[PDB]
């Protein structure tokens, strides 16, 4: 409970939903982000990415 | 209580011992007895003040009715903020004190003074039984470090005459006894004795640090921290929770360790446990002062400390920590942009919801003065209930009051502009349409900020210095200012466009009666070839109007706009189609002729008629407006057939890959150019409706052609992209992909073609995403390098001028001379159109009359009374800048020229697209005789004259006196035209490729012995090569005259590398023969920040003297290659080059002091020390202007020249000086001392001249003061150096008066600053 709740409450991949137009709940569950823990060369941007 | 200078240094401990109070011993908890913490605990009751208006610290005496009473329990008094400078806690604690100025800062004050290594400074703690203090019978060193057993042996063997302490207080026991006036003189005699690499590397600078410390006048015994200073809780942020990521953690740790120390010193504990408590106390104290000290890694949350005691001056290392951070300014707001085009340039709007509370004290004062609201509560009842009286007061105040508007990103000086508010319903401000494009803010949800100036002088400067009616000609650009886009230009293009077959053709009518005829019925606006009445005024005398009338051929809309046109203007600016450039040049002419107020009123009326007739004009695009070219599919089919046949021959085996690539480039370029020409000549002559001629070429009625011909934002590329093909464009380089894309916006695109389109779009957005950090970081350094500039002189009085040689290339001039005439003021040596005479009395302004005077004369370049050279020895003067602002007056003293100059550099570089996309003869374009200047002419036996030099200059007098053709010929070329032969233009004068630079020989005769070898220099399958320097690695000398003669009777015979020379041995050829044919990320950058960092080139050039004879020995030797024949031989000075380019020094290139470019670009260090100052300055300005004309954004030369002048700091003067031996000295401080060396008439006192390149970043982060150059720095390492050196600031810099806050010496208050000159000196 000190690891599951901490990961599900405060993480870069789990943020606040833009819970507005019905399309948003689809495109927020069906998006791909390279930022976060693991698999990120540079945090700001990247030319080869 | 005034103040002049601010000097921070370590004061004497006697004032701290006189202020010794406080009881911070035990950490008792916070109690709720008297709603505050109690005595001798956390927040002890010693250093408190009154938390309310008047009270004691216990519930006791000192009411407000009685003053001057010493408190019973405490020692505080009645008054505030004066007792707090005395009642501070000064308790002795931790006698092994912290010396973090030797730990955190890179020099060591206490370590280098007592000859202590840095490893011993890092190992003061966890110590082993003391250091032996010197005495009578002591044998070892006074700073000798021994172990515990060795110190016990020394204690049992020494006995008498030995006084030492336990901890690290013994060094203080030396420093209390330090009356040293002998060791520093021995160290400086040792420094002047020997000079080698063991004294330069971190010994010379610490020796000079001890020299600056011993001559500052301060005692070293003042460095002893006997007590621990405790700040008052009233001056600290008060917190009654009370501990939430703040000082209280380390506070209770230090008080707990103090309690443990005092308890184990009162209970007589053994040595080991009190040693552990003392080292934990030191670990608390040094972490309380300065965090880290290269250890104690941060854990995270409140179990680890975050804010220390000296962390108040800098908590964050970004931009906002205690150094005058961004304060939330009251009487201000934030507002959302729109546009209302119904007010003048001086008038604007403001929301009702914001403006009801921007003028609360003004409405309160008017209600108190009018006698309706006698009290402030009645004023609140009148304002916050919205009665009609406060609406009338709001209407009275808002009608006449200046209100500033700005943007939250403000990278221009034009961002802050004052306007006049109007009560408009809603809660969104509008922005004036002659202001929107100047802020570089579109209508895409950007947010502006609203400010209210509150004094007499602030309102006067808002109405006199900062608005839109006094910021004209764009000093960031030096180009036209604001002519609108897409609406006003569109309306004035539609109403002034001529067309045949008008309703009621050929009417004779007066001026204003055409508006009488047009408004009712039966008249079109086109109205071509009709002569009507027009009244034109001209000015020939000193502002005198000439009344004239005329009958001129024009249209309806042009003659209606002629009433909008003011009295005196020419007529030829009206007869055109009136595009964007025509309105821009019309605004330029009316600003040049009629002044400022008539051109502001006329631009207002242009705005009025544009946004009033744009609704009458009517723009419309649709399904039929986009003209599809009828010859599109045939061109696409024949281009596809050509590409298919050429790739069939490609896979046949005749074409290589790069040849197919270049053929794809130029064939698809020909294809979409044919599509563009097809849609153009199908777009021109569609309309054939006319009168009396029944067939006439007429401008079509399509909208896209009108917006293309208008030239506001519609270019030809977007025109050929909309109706024609999109084109071929790749993502990484913008290259041309061989896959065919023949799509159109009228048809359906393919999936892969739109995929390549979004390749291009995402690559363009990834290129434009760099503009944030490129613009946010560069202007920081550009303004911070130009901080200390106070213009304070009008009489400059210099003699050395700058030869203004332009970058003229080709027939037509690219960068003209007219922009260099205006602005700066030339020196006393300029000439008339007559020969050999003078034109100025040395004080003459330069604009269009004097520009015509300096255009009609016969001179190539003039000298300019200007910058850097001799500088009047009093500030920067005024003739170097001249006139570049909106006013034509000379920029006088007290104006921040450098702050304008720094923001006027990369104003919109922003890396627009693809990092600005990054012949085989010499064809001329201008006529005139060719005279070889600085060209070593060698007579060839073939009948021609080759060019055996690298410099080529020529002055031309054909129409203007200034030259228009230089054509610098590369070294080793064959000139097809002789010296003094007339050319007609468009003819190749040099039949040699510019990419190849061979070495043409100088003398004929017998070939030097360079006999071949199998595989070393020859390639066999005359054309018999004898020497190849690039293949072997030079083993070549000077050739003989005829057979064996020396070259002493009238500089080395060269051959290029990897070439096959057709001249063999034993051929006896003549002199002048030509040898064989074989000889993007940098340009995409703005190239501004790297010049401020003083970047290093790849290969430096070879420098020599007047004796520049060169020679080479074998291939390689024991030393490096190319042991130099010049320099060494007359003056002993050697150089070592490991590897560079091929040597090109010959007899054609004269070698002197300041040698020409031989092996790549030489670094500007030696170019500034040896060539000159103005040469490096003009070279840097020309390189930055070449980068900017490659980008396509014009900038100012004076701003770049002032930036290069700011790069000229940190020189090393000649060693014949007063306490000066290869020392980095300030250039301004060196040129102040010219008069001291001139009055004494001695070369030993001061140096002659010096100038070094040393970095603009280092000059911007290390200045004369410590308050300035501290934003992008660490505050602690600057304050420790300022405290050891004892350096004051005298409150003169601009950043100093920004951070501190006084009468700033830039602007209108400098005379008030001169009132301070009338206050201190003789006042």
């Amino acid at each position: 409970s000190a690891a599951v709740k901490e990961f599900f409450g405060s993480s870069q991949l789990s943020q606040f939903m833009d819970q507005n137009n019905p399309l948003s709940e689809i495109t927020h569950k069906r998006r791909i982000s390279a930022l976060g823990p693991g698999g990120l060369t540079r945090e700001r941007a990247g030319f080869e990415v | 209580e005034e103040f002049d200078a601010i000097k921070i240094a370590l004061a004497s401990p006697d004032m701290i011992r006189s202020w010794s109070f406080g009881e911070v011993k035990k950490p008792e908890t916070i109690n709720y007895r008297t709603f505050k913490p109690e005595r001798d605990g956390l927040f002890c009751a010693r250093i408190f003040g009154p938390v309310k208006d008047y009270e004691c610290l216990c519930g006791k005496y000192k009411r407000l009715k009685h003053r001057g009473v010493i408190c019973e329990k405490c020692g505080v008094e009645v008054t505030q903020t004066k007792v707090r400078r005395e009642r501070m806690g000064h308790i002795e604690l931790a006698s092994p004190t912290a010396h973090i100025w030797f730990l955190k800062s890179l020099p060591s004050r206490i370590g280098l003074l007592l000859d202590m290594p840095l490893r011993d400074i890092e190992r003061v703690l966890y110590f082993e039984s003391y250091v032996v203090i010197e005495g009578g019978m002591t044998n070892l060193e006074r700073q000798q470090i021994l172990t515990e057993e060795q110190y016990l042996d020394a204690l049992e063997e020494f006995g008498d005459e030995f006084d030492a302490k336990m901890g690290a207080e013994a060094i203080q026991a030396l420093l209390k006894s330090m009356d040293l006036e002998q060791e520093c003189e021995q160290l400086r005699e040792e420094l002047n004795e020997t000079n080698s690499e063991t004294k330069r590397k971190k010994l010379t600078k610490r020796i000079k640090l001890l020299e600056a410390f011993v001559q500052s006048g301060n005692k070293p015994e003042w460095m002893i921290l006997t007590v621990l200073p405790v700040l008052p809780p009233d001056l600290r942020p008060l917190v009654p929770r009370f501990a939430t990521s703040d000082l209280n953690d380390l506070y209770r740790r230090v008080i707990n360790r103090n309690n443990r120390l005092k308890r184990l010193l009162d209970l007589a504990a053994p040595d080991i446990i009190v040693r552990n408590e003392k080292r934990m106390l030191q670990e608390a104290v040094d972490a309380l002062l300065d965090n880290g000290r290269r250890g104690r890694a941060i854990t995270g949350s409140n179990k680890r400390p975050l804010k220390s005691l000296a962390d108040m001056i800098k908590g964050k290392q970004g931009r906002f920590r205690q150094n005058l951070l961004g304060k939330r300014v009251d009487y201000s707001g934030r507002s959302v942009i729109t546009v209302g085009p119904y007010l003048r340039l001086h008038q604007c709007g403001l929301p009702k919801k914001m403006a009801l509370e921007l003028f609360k004290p003004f409405i309160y004062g008017k209600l108190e003065l009018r006698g309706l609201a006698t009290t402030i509560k009645a004023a609140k009842k009148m304002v916050e209930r919205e009665e009609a009286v406060v609406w009338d007061i709001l209407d009275e105040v808002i009608r006449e009051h200046p209100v500033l508007l700005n943007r939250a990103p403000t990278l221009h000086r034009l961002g802050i502009q004052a306007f006049e508010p109007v009560l408009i319903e809603g809660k969104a401000i509008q922005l004036h349409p002659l202001v929107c494009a100047a802020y570089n803010a579109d209508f895409d949800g950007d947010q502006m900020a609203v400010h209210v100036p509150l004094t007499l002088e602030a309102q006067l400067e808002a109405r006199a210095l900062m608005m839109s009616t006094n910021n004209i000609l764009s000093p960031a650009n030096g180009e036209p200012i604001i002519v609108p886009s897409q609406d006003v230009v569109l309306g004035l293009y539609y109403m002034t466009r001529d067309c045949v077959n008008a309703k009621g053709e050929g009417m004779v009518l007066t001026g204003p009666k055409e508006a009488e005829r047009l408004y009712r019925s039966g008249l079109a606006s086109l109205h071509a070839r009709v002569k009507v009445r027009i009244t034109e005024y001209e000015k020939d005398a000193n502002g005198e109007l000439v009344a004239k009338t005329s009958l001129k051929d024009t249209t309806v809309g042009r003659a209606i706009l002629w009433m909008i046109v003011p009295k005196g203007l020419p007529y030829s600016i009206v007869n055109q189609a009136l595009g964007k450039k025509a309105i821009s040049k019309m605004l330029n002419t009316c600003y040049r002729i009629l002044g400022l107020k008539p051109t502001v009123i006329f631009a207002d009326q242009i705005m009025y008629t544009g946004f009033a007739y744009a609704a009458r004009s009517g723009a419309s695009v649709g399904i039929d407006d986009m003209v599809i070219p009828e010859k599109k599919h045939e061109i696409i089919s024949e281009a596809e057939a050509e590409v298919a046949e050429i790739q069939e021959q490609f896979q046949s085996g005749l074409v290589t890959a790069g040849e197919r690539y270049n053929k794809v480039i130029d064939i698809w370029a020909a294809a979409n150019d044919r599509v563009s020409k097809a849609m153009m000549d199908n777009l021109q002559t569609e309309t054939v409706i006319n009168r009396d001629g029944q067939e006439e070429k007429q401008v079509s009625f399509n909208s896209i052609y009108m917006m293309a011909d208008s030239g506001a934002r519609g270019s030809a590329a977007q025109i050929r992209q909309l109706a024609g093909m999109r084109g071929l464009m790749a993502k990484p380089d913008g290259s041309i992909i061989e896959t065919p894309i023949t799509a159109n916006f009228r048809e359906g695109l393919n999936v892969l073609q739109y995929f390549i389109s979004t390749h291009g779009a995402r690559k363009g957005l990834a290129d434009t995403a760099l503009k944030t950090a490129n613009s946010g970081y560069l202007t920081r350094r550009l303004v911070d390098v130009a901080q200390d500039l106070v213009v304070t002189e009008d009489d400059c009085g210099t003699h050395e001028g700058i030869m203004m040689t332009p970058v003229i290339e080709g027939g037509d001039v690219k960068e003209p001379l007219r922009d260099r005439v205006l602005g700066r003021v030339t020196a006393e040596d300029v000439l008339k159109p007559g020969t050999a005479d003078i034109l100025v009395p040395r004080n003459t302004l330069l604009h269009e009359q004097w520009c015509d005077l300096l255009e009609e004369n016969s001179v190539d370049a003039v000298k300019v009374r200007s910058v850097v050279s001799c500088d009047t020895d009093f500030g920067v003067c005024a003739h170097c800048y001249g006139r570049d602002l909106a006013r034509g007056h000379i920029i006088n003293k007290g104006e921040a020229i450098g702050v304008i100059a720094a923001q006027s550099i990369g104003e919109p570089g922003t890396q627009l697209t693809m990092r600005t996309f990054h012949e085989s003869s010499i064809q001329v374009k201008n006529k005139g005789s060719i005279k070889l200047s600085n060209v070593k002419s060698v007579v060839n036996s073939s009948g021609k004259l080759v060019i055996t030099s690298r410099n080529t200059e020529l002055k031309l007098i054909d129409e203007f006196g200034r030259t228009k053709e230089s054509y610098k010929v590369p070294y080793g070329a064959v000139l097809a035209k002789g010296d003094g032969e007339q050319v007609a233009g468009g003819e190749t004068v040099a039949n040699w490729d510019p990419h190849t630079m061979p070495v043409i020989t100088e003398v004929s005769g017998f070939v030097r012995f360079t006999d071949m070898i199998d595989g070393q220099t020859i390639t066999r399958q005359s054309s018999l090569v004898v020497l190849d320097s690039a293949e072997r690695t030079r083993p070549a000398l000077k050739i003989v005259d005829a057979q064996g003669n020396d070259v002493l009777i009238p500089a080395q015979y060269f051959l290029p590398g990897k070439a096959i020379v057709q001249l063999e041995d034993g051929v006896q050829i003549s002199s002048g023969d030509t040898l064989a044919r074989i000889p993007d990320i940098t340009g995409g950058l703005p190239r501004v920040a790297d010049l401020f960092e003083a970047r290093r080139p790849k290969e430096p050039a070879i420098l020599a003297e007047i004796s520049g004879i060169v020679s080479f020995g074998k291939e390689t030797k024991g030393k490096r290659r190319l042991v130099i024949t010049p320099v060494d031989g007359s003056d002993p000075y050697e150089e070592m080059i490991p590897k560079w380019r091929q040597l090109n020094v010959f007899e054609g290139e004269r070698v002197e002091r300041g040698d020409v470019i031989s092996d790549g670009p030489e670094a500007p260090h030696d170019i500034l020390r040896l060539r000159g100052v103005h040469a490096v300055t003009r070279y840097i300005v020309n390189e930055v202007q070449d980068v900017y004309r490659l980008q396509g954004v014009k900038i100012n030369d004076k701003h770049i020249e002032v930036i290069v002048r700011q790069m000229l700091r940190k020189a090393t003067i000649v060693n014949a000086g007063s306490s000066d031996f290869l020392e980095g000295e300030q250039v301004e401080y060196s040129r102040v001392k010219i008069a001291n060396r001139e009055l004494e008439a001695n070369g030993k006192v001061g140096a002659t001249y010096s100038r070094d390149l040393l970095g603009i970043t280092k000059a911007s982060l290390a200045t004369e003061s410590f308050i300035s150059a501290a934003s992008f720095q660490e505050t602690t390492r600057v304050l420790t150096e300022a405290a050891v050196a004892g350096k004051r600031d005298e409150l003169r810099g601009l950043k100093e008066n920004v951070i501190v806050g006084r009468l700033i010496p830039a602007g209108t208050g400098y005379a008030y600053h001169q009132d301070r000159m009338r206050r201190r000196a003789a006042g």
């Binding site: - | 209580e1 005034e2 103040f3 002049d4 200078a5 601010i6 000097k7 921070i8 240094a9 370590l10 004061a11 004032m15 701290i16 912290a98 973090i100 100025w101 921290l225 200073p229 700040l231 001056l235 002062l289 300065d290 005691l309 000296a310 108040m312 001056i313 205690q322 150094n323 005058l324 304060k327 939330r328 300014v329 009251d330 009487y331 004290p361 003004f362 309160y364 004062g365 108190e368 003065l369 509150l454 004094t455 007499l456 602690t1276 304050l1279 420790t1280 405290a1283 004051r1288 951070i1299 501190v1300 806050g1301």
Partner: protein, 48 residues
């Protein structure tokens, strides 16, 4: 306008009474900066 309580109060009184004057001295925030610089080992005195 953004720094001082006494300064904003004096400007409020000058805007109600219609005076529009400047300040007679130091805003005492640079004194807070000097106090935070006195948190180090250096002891700062004032020079006039």
């Amino acid at each position: 306008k953004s720094d001082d309580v006494n300064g904003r109060t004096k400007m409020y009184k000058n805007i109600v009474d219609g005076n529009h004057q400047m300040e007679p001295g130091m805003p005492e925030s640079f004194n807070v900066l000097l106090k935070e610089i006195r948190s180090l080992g250096i002891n700062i005195e004032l020079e006039d």
